[PDB]
Ligand binder design. Structure first.
Ligand SMILES: *[C@@H]1O[C@H](CO)[C@@H](O)[C@H](O)[C@H]1NC(C)=O
Length: 602
């Protein structure tokens, strides 16, 4: 018989209230629980009334899985959730942070630092639109993006996930949100959640707040800054996210002035909810509540109390769900956490689910599987990669011929370096694995492959990963393209003191450029020590982490398009200067924010 919450014609708030009024405390606490697919089974999902699942980095049904395999996984979990008494569908989240990057064959877009270099918010919106389609190709409805961190110290291992050290650029790139979710209607109230329907995904502004601040660039640590600095650097892009209807916000592992974000009622409830009027749901980071305590996990009862009372709505447990549900149930039953707090959390979670159409379309659309890796999206990623490139040098003296653009017809050319033919390295972190990987880890085009696809048929292309100087001098080359840089990383292994690229990288550039004129392509997540690379090179391009479409690099090297990218952050002279930002008394950059040379298309 008729149940108001099941009626798709009714207003979202009426459906939320109708469902909430029917729910037991177990059904309510279940909605607030997000678990890893690695611990999920149909019985676990039904018995514990689970509200959400995720894949963390690298959590996949198998290596090489097709889009249909992901849809079958997500639907198998959804069938269990739809079989509960109330039939509340789960929402499945994943880090689709530069495309649907855990998935084999997904288009991999440039990381956010390179997107900052484009200064093109419409390009970023189009990337959100394409990412939503590739996430929905795999049956998933929720992406943990954008990271709107304002990275103020490039020693941070996640600096490549920040569009810029300048909050104005980060604010402009919140256009990712209506890409992913759809544009909000003209009448829209700031802070409400929005998703247009089954071809879009819920988004997540992360990590709230000051994740880009931290002392020594140390990940998951203390950001020391006064309120004016928190509010003028780290917070503004959250208001833009409210204006664009971001559906969820994820809290940072970081602390602000010694207070853990996951326990900060003043910021999570007083500011985000009560001042910005955010009406979507607030989600923890991975074991974020565990890390409220030192050591982490040493008083999980307190972690649950502190986080839920701070105003978090959904907890990314993600493994110990039985303990989580047991502890929260105990707190509620003991009067330590009031029912009004549970009811607010569930109201917000249900509001996002109903608003996005999840009750109407809980299952995957098999017709969407073919969106994965679509050529139109690879053409977009190629455009973005080319626009992200920043030309740092194009001739050793003011009187030399500019090396770039290079001619496509030459008798023989050399492609060299550890990063010339390594797809994993050109994608960086958060690609297939959490920390990324080496070699041909997915479908794409390396810089070597892109050169071979670009050049005249008469041009002989020789590859040598690490040639010695004599090989280059004897090879009869017209010029060389040498690609080197950082290996893939995230915070842990990415948080780095010295910011010097691994060897051999510099040695290869010096060997190659000593023998023939060279264009050096530097692959990195951030500024790295660069004076020695510059001294050896005729031309040098900061290519950041350009993703699967290596032809974006060659589109500018061979002059099909001019270089237009500009630094979205300061390039330091030495790591001893750090942190070093505009307005600091010691500001003395090698290249300033906004620097970049240009070429004209040939
Ligand atoms: C590119 O073209 C413009 C005129 O259209 C010219 O002013 C500029 O100097 C050229 N730039 C380069 C790098 O040749």
């Amino acid at each position: 018989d008729y149940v108001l919450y099941k009626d798709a014609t009714k207003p979202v708030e009426d459906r939320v209230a109708d469902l909430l009024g029917r729910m037991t405390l177990a059904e309510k606490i279940g909605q607030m629980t997000q678990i890893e697919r690695l611990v999920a089974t149909p019985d676990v999902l039904r018995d514990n009334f689970i509200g959400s699942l995720l894949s963390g980095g690298g959590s996949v049904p198998r290596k090489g899985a097709t889009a249909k395999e992901w849809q079958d996984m997500v639907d198998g979990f959804q069938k269990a959730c739809m079989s509960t008494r109330l039939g509340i569908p789960m929402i499945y989240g994943i880090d689709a942070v530069h495309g649907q990057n855990n998935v084999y064959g997904a288009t991999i877009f440039p990381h956010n630092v390179g997107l900052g270099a484009t200064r093109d918010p419409y390009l970023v919106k189009r990337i959100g639109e394409a990412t939503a389609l590739e996430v929905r190709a795999t049956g998933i409805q929720y992406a943990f993006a954008p990271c709107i961190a304002v990275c103020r110290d490039p020693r941070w291992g996640r600096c490549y996930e920040s569009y810029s050290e300048d909050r104005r650029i980060v604010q402009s790139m919140t256009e990712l949100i209506p890409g992913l979710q759809g544009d909000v209607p003209k009448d829209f109230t700031s802070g409400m959640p929005f998703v247009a329907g089954k071809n879009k995904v819920a988004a997540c502004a992360k990590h709230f707040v000051g994740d880009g601040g931290t002392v020594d660039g140390i990940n998951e640590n203390n950001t020391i800054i006064n309120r004016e600095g928190l509010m003028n650097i780290h917070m503004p892009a959250y208001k833009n996210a409210m204006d664009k209807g971001v559906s969820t916000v994820m809290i940072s592992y970081s602390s602000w002035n010694g207070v853990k974000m996951h326990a900060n009622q003043d910021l999570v409830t007083g500011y985000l909810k009560d001042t910005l009027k955010f009406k979507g749901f607030v989600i923890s980071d991975w074991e974020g509540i565990d890390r409220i305590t030192t050591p982490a996990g040493s008083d999980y009862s307190y972690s649950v109390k502190a986080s839920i009372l701070a105003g978090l709505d959904m907890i990314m447990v993600p493994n110990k769900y039985q303990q989580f549900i047991s502890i929260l149930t105990g707190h509620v039953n003991g009067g330590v956490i009031p029912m009004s707090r549970i009811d607010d959390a569930v109201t917000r979670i249900l509001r996002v689910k109903f608003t996005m159409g999840l009750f109407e379309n809980p299952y995957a659309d098999p017709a969407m599987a073919e969106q994965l890796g679509k050529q139109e999206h690879r053409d977009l990623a190629r455009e973005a990669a080319r626009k992200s490139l920043v030309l740092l040098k194009n001739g050793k003296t003011s009187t030399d011929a500019p090396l770039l653009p290079l001619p496509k017809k030459a008798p023989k050319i050399l492609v060299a370096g550890s990063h010339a033919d390594n797809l994993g390295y050109q994608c960086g972190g958060w690609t297939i694995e959490w920390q990324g990987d080496t070699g041909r880890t997915t479908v794409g085009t390396t810089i070597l492959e892109a050169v071979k696809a670009a050049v005249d048929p008469s041009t002989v292309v020789v590859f040598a990963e690490n040639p010695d100087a004599e090989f280059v001098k004897s090879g009869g080359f017209s010029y060389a393209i040498v690609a080197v840089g950082e290996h893939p990383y995230t915070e842990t292994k990415g948080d780095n003191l010295n910011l010097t690229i691994p060897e051999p990288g510099l040695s290869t550039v010096q060997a190659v450029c000593g023998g023939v004129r060279c264009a050096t392509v530097l692959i990195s997540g951030r500024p790295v020590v660069v004076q020695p690379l510059l001294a050896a090179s005729d031309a040098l391009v900061a290519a950041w982490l350009p993703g699967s479409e290596g032809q974006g690099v060659t589109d500018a090297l061979f002059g099909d398009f001019g270089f237009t990218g500009r630094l979205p952050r300061t390039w330091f002279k030495s790591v001893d200067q750090l942190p070093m930002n505009v307005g600091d008394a010691h500001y003395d950059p090698l290249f300033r924010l906004g620097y970049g040379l240009t070429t004209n298309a040939t």
